[PDB]
């Protein structure tokens, strides 16, 4: 039993809300939020700018000191860093940006990181200003993460599109 409140449950391990990711956090304070990253880890806007923001700042602050010190993340991959006041852990996930011409292929490498962590609250990899259809985004988070994820889905309109149309 978690703390989780108000999913939908698509399969055994993969439940979904309509929410902001910003705010189910600072509620339910998971172990591990997971950041929609890219790699340089500047958290500018989306997902990782609000994080960032609810941080007061504190997560572009840890991650430069992250970057000086170990350099660029590669697309497909991630690193575990603090949660500050929104979790234990942050889990920073670089899916393709497909703006930036990344492959979509890579968005099943970004996935396979949740493997690693037994409960995550996430927001769909590479959805919003990543520019990839967060229909296929869902589809491959299910068919490739296996420990128990909480998606949060901003976009009313698109939460009811992504459950309507899951097969
Ligand atoms: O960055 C994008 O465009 C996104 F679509 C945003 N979206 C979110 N998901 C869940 N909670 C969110 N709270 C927010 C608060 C904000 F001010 C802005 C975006 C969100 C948000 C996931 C993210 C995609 C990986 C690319």
């Given at each position: 039993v978690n703390s989780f409140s108000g999913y939908l449950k698509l399969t055994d391990n993969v439940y979904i809300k309509n929410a902001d990711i910003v705010e189910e956090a600072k509620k339910v304070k998971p172990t591990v939020v997971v950041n929609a990253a890219n790699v340089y880890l500047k958290h500018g806007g989306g997902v990782a700018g609000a994080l960032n923001k609810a941080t007061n700042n504190a997560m572009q602050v840890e991650s430069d000191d992250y970057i000086a010190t170990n350099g660029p993340l590669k697309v497909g991959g991630s690193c575990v860093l603090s949660g500050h006041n929104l979790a234990k852990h942050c889990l920073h996930v670089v899916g393709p940006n497909v703006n930036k011409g990344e492959d979509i292929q890579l968005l099943k490498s970004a996935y396979?990181?949740?493997?690693?962590?037994?409960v995550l609250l996430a927001p769909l990899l590479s959805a919003g200003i990543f520019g990839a259809d967060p229909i296929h985004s869902l589809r491959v988070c299910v068919d490739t993460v296996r420990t128990n994820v909480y998606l949060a889905v901003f976009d009313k309109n698109l939460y009811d599109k992504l459950v309507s149309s899951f097969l």
């Open positions: 396979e990181n949740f493997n690693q962590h037994e």
